[PDB]
Amino acid sequence: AVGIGAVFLGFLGAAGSTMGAASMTLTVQARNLLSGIVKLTVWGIKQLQARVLAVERYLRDQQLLGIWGCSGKLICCTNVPWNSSWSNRNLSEIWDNMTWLQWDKEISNYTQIIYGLLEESQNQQEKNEQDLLALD
């Protein structure tokens, strides 16, 4: 669905829709991951067990954007050429069919490998952070 006011249970129908339609309203998930709906007894300690991990998982995701150069951007291009071994070079035709829930099954093995290249991509920039240009 397209729209951003919405509800977290207003957009997740895109879990079956196309990746193109799912690419819009990409912010509502980013809102929901923060806090959501959350004498001493079981629920009291559970509010400390679950809450701290909800914060912990969010930091680990923003940790990777802050390094790859995609800080604060939902969509983000990166300087990595797509190797055809990971997938065929015609996804631009295909992602009008697949949903994101189906795309993940293809890159399941290669996702940890790809993160190295994105790290390398930033370090094509980081190798260029000492030499010449920024005398200004």
Partner: peptide, 8 residues
């Protein structure tokens, strides 16, 4: 039962 944030 309400799941915490990050889970659905």
């Amino acid at each position: 039962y309400c799941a915490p944030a990050g889970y659905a």
